[PDB]
Amino acid sequence: YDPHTSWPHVEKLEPWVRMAEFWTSSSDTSFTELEMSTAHYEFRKFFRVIICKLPFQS
Amino acid sequence: VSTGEFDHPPFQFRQRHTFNTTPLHDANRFGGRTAYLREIGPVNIKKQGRRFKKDPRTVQFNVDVWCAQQTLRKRWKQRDWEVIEIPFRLVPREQQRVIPELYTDIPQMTDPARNDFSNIRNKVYDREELQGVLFPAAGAMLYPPLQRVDKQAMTLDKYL
Amino acid sequence: LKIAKSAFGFYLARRGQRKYPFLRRPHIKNTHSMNPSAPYFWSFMTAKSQMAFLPEENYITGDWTGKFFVSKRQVYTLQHATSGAKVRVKSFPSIFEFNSPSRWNIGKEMNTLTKPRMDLIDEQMLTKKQRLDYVRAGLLPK
Amino acid sequence: EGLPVRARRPIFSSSAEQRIAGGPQRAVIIQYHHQPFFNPEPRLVKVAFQCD
Amino acid sequence: GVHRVGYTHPSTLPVPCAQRWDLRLARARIFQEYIEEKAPGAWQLEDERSM
Amino acid sequence: WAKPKKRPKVGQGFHEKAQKWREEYLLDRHRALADSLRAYVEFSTSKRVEPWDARFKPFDRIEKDGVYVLMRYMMEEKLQLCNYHHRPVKRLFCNIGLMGPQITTKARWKPYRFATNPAGTSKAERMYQRDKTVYTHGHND
Amino acid sequence: MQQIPGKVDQTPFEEDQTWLLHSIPVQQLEMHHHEKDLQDLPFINHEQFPRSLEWNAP
Amino acid sequence: GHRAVAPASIDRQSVCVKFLMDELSEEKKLPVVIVVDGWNLFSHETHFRYPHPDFLRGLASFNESSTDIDLYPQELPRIPASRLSFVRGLNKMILSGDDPNKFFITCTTRDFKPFDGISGFPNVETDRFANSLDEYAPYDPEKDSHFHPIQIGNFDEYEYRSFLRFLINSGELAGLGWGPLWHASSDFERKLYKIGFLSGRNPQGVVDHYHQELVWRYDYQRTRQKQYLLKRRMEGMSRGA
Amino acid sequence: LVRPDVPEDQYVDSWYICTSMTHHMGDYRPWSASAPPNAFRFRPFNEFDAKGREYVQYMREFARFDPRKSRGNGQKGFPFRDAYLTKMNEANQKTPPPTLETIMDRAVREHHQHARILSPLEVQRDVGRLEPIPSYAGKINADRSVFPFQWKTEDWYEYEVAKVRNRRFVFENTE
Amino acid sequence: QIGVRIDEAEVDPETGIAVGRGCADGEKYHFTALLRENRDHNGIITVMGKPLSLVLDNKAWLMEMVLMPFDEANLDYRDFDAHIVSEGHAMPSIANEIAAFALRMAVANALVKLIPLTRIPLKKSGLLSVDRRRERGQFPGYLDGKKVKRRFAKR
Amino acid sequence: LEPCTPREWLQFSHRNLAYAYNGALRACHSLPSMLLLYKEMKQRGVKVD
Amino acid sequence: RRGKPRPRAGMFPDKYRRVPMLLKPQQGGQQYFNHFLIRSTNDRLTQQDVDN
Amino acid sequence: NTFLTSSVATPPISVIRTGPKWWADPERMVRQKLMYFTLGVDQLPLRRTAVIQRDLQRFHMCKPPPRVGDSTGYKRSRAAQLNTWYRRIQYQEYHMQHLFTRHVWGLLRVYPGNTTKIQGKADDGYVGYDSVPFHRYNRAPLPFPARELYERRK
Amino acid sequence: ENQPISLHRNNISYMEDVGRSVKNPTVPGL
Amino acid sequence: DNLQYKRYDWQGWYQRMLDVHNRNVSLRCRICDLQRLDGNGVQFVDMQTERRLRILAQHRVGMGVLKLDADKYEDQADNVTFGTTKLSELLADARKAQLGEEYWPSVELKVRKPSGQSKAHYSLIDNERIEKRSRELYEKYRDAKKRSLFVTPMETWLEVKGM
Amino acid sequence: RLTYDHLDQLQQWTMRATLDGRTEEFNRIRDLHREWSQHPLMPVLGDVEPKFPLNLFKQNHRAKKRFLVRWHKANTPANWLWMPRGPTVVTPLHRTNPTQYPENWKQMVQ
Amino acid sequence: GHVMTPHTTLHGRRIFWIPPTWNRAGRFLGPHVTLYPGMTP
RNA sequence: AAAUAAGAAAUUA
Ligand SMILES: Nc1nc2c(ncn2[C@@H]2O[C@H](COP(=O)(O)OP(=O)(O)OP(=O)(O)O)[C@@H](O)[C@H]2O)c(=O)[nH]1
């Protein structure tokens, strides 16, 4: 993680997190009952960054 | 660090004028602007209303424009000055440098070496010190020179 | 849906009285489109600028055989009155005709000249139950 | 502390933005902080040059 | 205040200097920029919430 | 989820009824429109009650002093030209400048519907005695 | 703010009344943003790729 | 000047102020002390603005005069305080030499509404500043007045103590303070120390926090004292037994 | 405990199962293996807690800060917010003298009554021990220019915004 | 029986500063106090660059909460300079009792890092103790978005 | 006991170890048996009272 | 809730269940403890002089 | 007074039951005190109230002391008696506040909210500009413009 | 343990020396 | 893409879509490295040239680094062409500050309004004329006040055009 | 709603009144206060405010509030017998009449 | 609470046997989870 | 409709 201790080094990068909100009910009759059933699930994506700085181009 | 209200109250059961509670679009909120948002009366839902006036996102946007006006207004009442565009030669030693545009670099100190650290941005100059520069045509000085206080003079506060 | 007034009666659910985000309700039913205002006459349910051109629908765009009704966002023009030609619009049950031409119509869209929800009700499109419910609300006499 | 070292002797000019380096000279380490919070970037070494 | 915006051409000054508006026209040529003529001077409002 | 019952057929001769009813609803609407335009303009043209609430200051002050002096000698003509409609009245007061910041801040004005009463209005009941046959949005007398 | 020279203009108003009694309108219909319109509403927040919200263009 | 029925008072007062100041400036032997609180309001503009010129020209219709006065509000340049006839009188005495008869002992007021870079709308129920001025523009007594500036700070502790002692004790002696309930509030020293912390020793702050002391939640002194006095009384009653 | 007491990086919140699992099947490393050898309260470094480490670092960065070095760096080029803004403030620059009552009180106790007033750090507060007085005890002096951080709102706004806008102005490749 | 944990002092050797943190509502209020000794006896408390008076709006029942840790520890508040930093959700006004609770906590934790033994009074008076409470998460089932279930009718 | 888990570290101190060792000291009735304990507590750095 | 009676107050989990025991009530005033201790001690000696 | 409209009156006990939230909110109580102090009158009932309520707040998270069962019911009745005492101590205050506020408004040429008494000035409730054209409780017709309680000069 | 401030709700905040009120001073009503 | 959109009929359009999502080419240079002797011995960018460069490219400079993000064309190649062009066109215009002072951008000073001290003289402007006149106005007033109860300034020195 | 605005207007009124030597409204205010601020008497055991009977209506019903209101409506402060107002009342904490207040001080002199 | 601990039956710190699965449990998060975390050093 | 960062306290199977 520290650039003094290694080449290339690694930086963290904040994860992509999308939260899905939705009705779990299938009800034609009441809006209330639909709202009372609401789920939260997330999509996630995680990231690491690798940095290499070189003194020339190869 | 203002104590004022920046958020429109959320729609709920009808609020009424009570100890501890006032109507939502009451004339006392947002300096009486709430006039713009008000549907008066026992509104008959089916037939009448103006939809935008009950909508949270729309209403809040309007309120936010009003707050912005308030701040802008007070920032301009706060100015005593105009920006004059003066050629590089004639300007005081502190501005003879390069002065990065706003939000471009680090907020910048006027003269660290002379012990003045303050935003060059917000430094204001006296119309009287720039007289020779700003009104060269006039001959005789239009504004009479500032009179300054001797801080070495024995005066009432020095106990003499 | 309870009653199928169209095909969609079969496909759609009502979901009780359900809330939609502001100014998006799936079906555009403009009950208000004829809603009288003297002072707002030229700004209400009409073009936001008077320098806008009339819509697509006031013009014959291509080689046509003919049309049955013109669209309801078509705007009533002096020629609509003067020319004495059929001007139809699709309303319910079937079609509304502008038969009796007036200059007072001019410059407004036919949306605004056609009352969507009539004070008139057919007793024969109503179930005996529905007729009961229309008597409760004090609409139908009985 | 105590480690012998050759350090490029810093030369001080007001005319220089940044810094001026000069040939490596023999020197000893007086203190070197490992901990990042005592030694922020770019890292430093306190050093006593042997010459003077 | 309601005023006429004004511009002093550098040939007329008792020292020539490059006027900020002139520079603005330069910047508009370089990155081709629509200059909104009807933009009201009174309406500068930053967005408080995000700024 | 029950299978939707079929809708009964439309009606016989209801197409004629709907045509006629919409037809003369529109013909009626022409006169309703004509009349409400007449009303709207008659209102814009005619005088109104004074827009300011006299219960607060600087308005409570005796009619021979303060703001009323400022009105009688400097603003009178203009205040009468705009027929004491509350919008131009409040704007004129802003532009007279001799009150200056107070108009919105210290001064109180009557509420919208009261300020809209015809000059001469004595009893509050008047708000409710205006014509309901006319579509002006309370901008009619 | 730079303005076009020779154009009659106004300065931001200092007095509250000047703001309040001017002809500035309120937002009434649904509200639009030239970039953000492509991600429909705040609740439908359309995302082409799951990049970290903190991703930094090189 | 002032004894007349209105409107006459209005023109009479103008004449009278002009001549009063003209009389004051003409007296060279009798000491005259002029005390003005909030001079800094006299040295810049009043909050009045010059009437829009169309109030001066007379009109037929609003329809076409080429006039906007009814359509839009606008700001016209503020009237500077130096153009007030009264302030004119005073400035005339300050600026003219050959008046060493007169002494201005004068003051500044910082009473302005607070503004920190955003302002919401003030809640009208809770607003300490409703009667404050709208100013928000800086004032420097050196550049902005012809007077010799003297600076004043907050109380040092010697002032502060004397003042607080007064507010509390002479308040209580006048029947305006805790009275029979005195054992509910803490002792003087504790109040002094705490009100010091809260006020920063600013006098207005001291007055203010002295009142607010009624509501302190987190003060425990009288509680623990009461507790100890109790314990001591019960040990005494066990020793008597 | 529901699951072994171990640094949580070893656990993953399971998909489809309400439970956590170990991202290396069943192997476990104890807390001791996260930190350096004999690390006080297993810690990257023993001197301070996480926040202590942060603000110690900020203060050190700022002591060696020079504005000329900031060019070509992004937000790394910005000086520590609070300290810098405090310096930029002029009203801070004048630091009050030690008020008359204070200087008198201390004087009386150390000349008249033969006992100096101890600064709160030199006071011995353990009833059972006598500890060496910390080397910073009466030494560090008081300049409002230095601390506590106090600053103008305009400058703070400008600073914050600048620091956001400049994230990407970085010259990576430098000599 | 171990009474209360007495630690050593964690202080920046150069600046003589110690760092505590307060919380309330798990999200809303995170504060960090930098606390340092003032030898001139004019101490001051400052929050996000503004004097404590202004920040808490001169309300006494809020500011005395920030005084308390200096009391409990039997210390003179004037011997200390403090600056508090807001790390949580920013708001134009933090004057309210919850925010003040978090403040008091930050200050107390700093004080403990600075004067180790002072920890024992503080811990007993429950200053260092953290209450875990939160507004209920938002949730569309409820009318107000938090606590209120929708209307019910018998069939 | 030497702390193992962060939870265990929050219970731990040299200055409190003093207390425990003092107890263990008051327990020994003879000086010789005390000397050993003392040597320990001296060696593992324990704040002494 | 719905067409049914509200539960008695004791049927809900504790209202303050999330507040630590050291907070309810706060034991503040610690500053004074030592003071009163000394005081009382002192008083005891006073009460001997009366007797003896 | 800015808040002019007709209002809904709440029984004193429910107003007091708001405790710290309104009735005892420090902010509010302080400006009551200010009103009294400025009129040169001790605020004893306010101080009683503040005492009671201060302490209410301090112990508000604790469980009540353990109850032993008694045929007497002396404990239950003593707790009750104490409680209604405190209730009455606060009724008195609530009354004082409404009283003095109305009186002071009478001195300041302030117009109260709709349907409100000001002892010397408006005996029956004062009204002007209500949503309803008659005086609500008299059932008498309201004049235009709003009725004035005070002579004109300011 | 040592000398707790009252650990319980509903304690006696305020005491004074006062007379007794009349029996049933409240009118039964409406 | 190495995963899913790697290998079939959609690999093409997904690839292209990424490439177009990535068209941006960032072009940077430090203003430091622009200050160097030109082939003609004149410094390529001096102080005035730099001030002009900064004012011309506004938010496109930060931390003394000029940064152009070229997004215009779907392909990165074309964006380096475009970006490079804008750079030299902007340098070409900034370099005008070497043609003479007329092109040195102005400095914007915040110049205060006149001070309290100056404003004090506003009440002495035309002092003689105004006193001499106010005596005549006093006569006009004394006379007018025999007829009417209240004398307005509009009967004395103020002009209001009737028609 | 009593506002800081009103408090400032109050201050100025009070001042202007002090300087015109108007002692009368101060005296009316002093009187009012003396009457209604007396300490309320500790209630006898067995005396409590009535609650609303359970098993009458369901807990969500209006009747509950309707009772409370109608009770407090019937006990007006003129019906509060637990606070001792009257001419009969001895008032140790307060001054009795105008003659005992400081603006009378000249008659208090010997 | 005690009005719901039919429905809280999974929610403490619970040793499991079979851990619950998403077919059988709609909203449960798992036994290790802390919704109302305190700040600990 | 509610004892969940709010502030409510005494009539189990
Ligand atoms: N007796 C006495 N009271 C003082 C003194 N200074 C301040 N006070 C009290 O503290 C308050 C301080 O308020 P002001 O003196 O009006 O404050 P100021 O300096 O005029 O400040 P601004 O008007 O707001 O610029 C006063 O109202 C007094 O009641 C003093 O020197 N003697």
> Which letter does DSSP use for residue O43 in this model?
B
For J29, list phi and psi in degrees, rounded to 5: -120, 110
In this structure, how many other beta carbons lie within 10 angstroms of the beta carbon of residue P93? 13
Where is chain G discontinuous (C–N over 2.5 Å), named by the preceding residue?
none
Asked if O54 and B98 count as a contact pair (C-beta separation under 8 A), the reply is yes
Bond before O114 cis per omega within 30 degrees: no
User: Residue type for M55, please?
Assistant: D
Atom number in ligand 1 closest to CA H203: 10
Residue that has been written with the tokens 């600046």 in this structure: J15
For F52, list phi and psi in degrees, rounded to 5: -80, 145
In this structure, how many other beta carbons lie within 10 angstroms of the beta carbon of residue J27? 11
Resolution (A): 3.1
Helix (H, G, I), strand (E, B) or coil at B144: coil
Structure tokens at I43: 């810690």
- The DSSP bridge partners found for residue J22 are J31
Residue that has been written with the tokens 């629908």 in this structure: C57
Atom number in ligand 1 closest to CA H110: 25
CB contact under 8 A, M6 and B27: no
| Rounded Cα gap, residues F114 and I3, in angstroms | 72
Helix (H, G, I), strand (E, B) or coil at F91: helix
- Helical (H) or strand (E) element with A48: strand A38-51
Supply the DSSP string of chain M, one letter for each residue.
----S------HHHHHTTGGGTTT-HHHHHHHHHHHHHHT---HHHHHHHHHHHHHHHTTTSPPPPPPP-SS-HHHHHHHHHHHHHHHHHHHHHHHHHHHHHHHHHHTT---SSSEEETTTEEEEE--S-SSSB-TTT--BPBSS----S-S--
User: Strand J80-86 to strand J44-47: parallel, antiparallel, or no bridges (unpaired)?
Assistant: parallel
CA J5 to chain centre: 21
Supply the DSSP string of I69-137, one letter for each residue.
GGTT-SGGGSPPHHHHHHHH-STTSSPPP-THHHHHHHHIIIIISS-PPPPTTTS---SS---PPPTTT
For A18, list phi and psi in degrees, rounded to 5: -115, 130
Q: Please, what is the Cα angle at P23 between P22 and P27, to 5 degrees?
A: 140
Structure tokens at H55: 């109030």
| Rounded Cα gap, residues H224 and L33, in angstroms | 8
Q: What is the largest CA-CA distance in chain C?
A: 54
CA I71 to chain centre: 25
H110 in contact with ligand 1, CB cutoff 6 A? yes
In this structure, how many other beta carbons lie within 10 angstroms of the beta carbon of residue O25? 23
Residue that has been written with the tokens 């809603």 in this structure: C35
Q: J84, J93, J148, J151: which to substitute to probe chain B, counting the most B Cβ within 10 Å?
A: J93
User: Residue type for H221, please?
Assistant: Q
| Rounded Cα gap, residues H217 and P27, in angstroms | 35
Instruction: Assess M46–H contact: CB distance below 8 Å, yes or no.
Output: yes
- Helical (H) or strand (E) element with O83: helix O76-94
CB contact under 8 A, H143 and O122: no
- Helical (H) or strand (E) element with J34: strand J29-37
User: Strand H102-106 to strand I11-13: parallel, antiparallel, or no bridges (unpaired)?
Assistant: unpaired
Give every CB contact of residue J107 below 8 A, 6+ residues apart in sequence.
J20, J22, J33, J35, J45, J66, J69, J82, J84
Asked if K12 and J2 count as a contact pair (C-beta separation under 8 A), the reply is no
Enumerate the H helices of chain K as residue ranges: 6-9, 14-27, 31-43
Experimental approach was: cryo-EM
| Rounded Cα gap, residues D26 and D47, in angstroms | 10
| Rounded Cα gap, residues N15 and J58, in angstroms | 32
Residue that has been written with the tokens 């707040």 in this structure: M57
| Rounded Cα gap, residues I89 and I86, in angstroms | 5
- Helical (H) or strand (E) element with P36: helix P24-36
Q: Which of N15, I43, O141, O163 is nearest to H11 (CA)?
A: O141
Residue that has been written with the tokens 């819509």 in this structure: C55
Asked if E33 and E27 count as a contact pair (C-beta separation under 8 A), the reply is yes
| Rounded Cα gap, residues B4 and B20, in angstroms | 18
CB contact under 8 A, J140 and A38: yes
Q: Which of H131, H51, B36 is nearest to F106 (CA)?
A: H131
| Rounded Cα gap, residues G29 and B156, in angstroms | 67
- Helical (H) or strand (E) element with P107: helix P105-108
| Rounded Cα gap, residues D33 and A4, in angstroms | 14
First to last CA, chain P: 47
Burial group, residue D33, by CB count within 10 angstroms (0-12, 13-18, 19+): middle
Enumerate the H helices of chain L as residue ranges: 30-51
- The DSSP bridge partners found for residue M116 are M126
User: Residue type for D49, please?
Assistant: F
For F84, list phi and psi in degrees, rounded to 5: 50, 30
- Separation in Å: R4 C1' and H156 CA: 49
Touching chains, G (3+ CB pairs < 8 A): A, B, C, E, F, H, I, O
Over its C-alpha atoms, chain E yields an Rg (Å, rounded) of 15
Asked if J92 and H118 count as a contact pair (C-beta separation under 8 A), the reply is yes
Q: Which of H120, I28, O68 is nearest to I9 (CA)?
A: I28
Structure tokens at I166: 């400049």
For A56, list phi and psi in degrees, rounded to 5: -145, 180
Structure tokens at O72: 């215009």
Helix (H, G, I), strand (E, B) or coil at B118: strand
| Rounded Cα gap, residues O43 and O45, in angstroms | 6
In this structure, how many other beta carbons lie within 10 angstroms of the beta carbon of residue P88? 6
Q: Alpha carbon of H183 to those of H178, H213, H231, M87, N8: distances in Å?
A: 8, 14, 17, 22, 22
Burial group, residue H49, by CB count within 10 angstroms (0-12, 13-18, 19+): buried
Asked if N17 and P93 count as a contact pair (C-beta separation under 8 A), the reply is no
For chain J, how are helix, strand and coil distributed in percent, rounded to 5? 30, 20, 50
Q: H5, H9, H49, H129: which to substitute to probe chain F, counting the most F Cβ within 10 Å?
A: H49
Q: Please, what is the Cα angle at B55 between B54 and B57, to 5 degrees?
A: 145
Q: Which of C30, C28, C22, C27 is nearest to C46 (CA)?
A: C30
Q: Alpha carbon of J87 to those of C24, I82, J96, Q10: distances in Å?
A: 39, 13, 17, 35
Q: Which of E25, B36, O64 is nearest to D18 (CA)?
A: O64
- The DSSP bridge partners found for residue A19 are A42
User: Residue type for H7, please?
Assistant: P
Supply the DSSP string of I3-18, one letter for each residue.
S--S-GGGEEEPSSBS
Query: Whats the size of chain O, residue-wise?
Result: 163
Exposure class string for M88-117: b at 16+ Cβ within 10 A, else e: bbbbbbbbbbebbbbbbbbbbbbbbbbbbe
User: I38's torsion region: left (phi>0), alpha (psi -120 to 50) or beta?
Assistant: left
| Rounded Cα gap, residues H212 and H210, in angstroms | 6
Exposure class string for N1-30: b at 16+ Cβ within 10 A, else e: eeeebbeeeebebbeeeeeebeeebbeeee
Half-sphere exposure of residue Q29, counting CA atoms within 13 Å on the CB side? 12
H204 in contact with ligand 1, CB cutoff 6 A? yes
- Separation in Å: R9 C1' and L13 CA: 15
User: Residue type for P95, please?
Assistant: R
| Rounded Cα gap, residues D47 and D4, in angstroms | 10
Q: What is the 3-state secondary structure (H, E, C) of I22-61?
A: ECCCCCCCCHHHCCCCCCCCCCCCCCCCHHHHHHHHHHHH
Instruction: Assess L28–H contact: CB distance below 8 Å, yes or no.
Output: yes
Asked if O160 and O154 count as a contact pair (C-beta separation under 8 A), the reply is yes
User: Strand H45-49 to strand H78-80: parallel, antiparallel, or no bridges (unpaired)?
Assistant: antiparallel
Burial group, residue I2, by CB count within 10 angstroms (0-12, 13-18, 19+): middle
Over its C-alpha atoms, chain Q yields an Rg (Å, rounded) of 12
H211 in contact with ligand 1, CB cutoff 6 A? no
Half-sphere exposure of residue I24, counting CA atoms within 13 Å on the CB side? 6
Helix-then-strand count for chain H, H and E: 9, 4
| Rounded Cα gap, residues J104 and H218, in angstroms | 12
Q: Which of F115, F114, F70 is nearest to F95 (CA)?
A: F70
Asked if M59 and L26 count as a contact pair (C-beta separation under 8 A), the reply is no
Instruction: List the D24-31 sheet strands across, edge first.
Output: D4-8, D24-31, D46-49
- Separation in Å: R8 C1' and C21 CA: 38
Asked if M39 and M32 count as a contact pair (C-beta separation under 8 A), the reply is no
| Rounded Cα gap, residues I38 and I46, in angstroms | 9
Asked if Q13 and Q29 count as a contact pair (C-beta separation under 8 A), the reply is no
| Rounded Cα gap, residues M29 and M54, in angstroms | 12
Bond before M145 cis per omega within 30 degrees: yes
Q: Alpha carbon of N7 to those of B47, I10, J130, M11, M65: distances in Å?
A: 59, 44, 19, 32, 8
Residue that has been written with the tokens 């500050």 in this structure: O97
For F91, list phi and psi in degrees, rounded to 5: -70, -45
Asked if P76 and N30 count as a contact pair (C-beta separation under 8 A), the reply is no
Structure tokens at H125: 């129920």
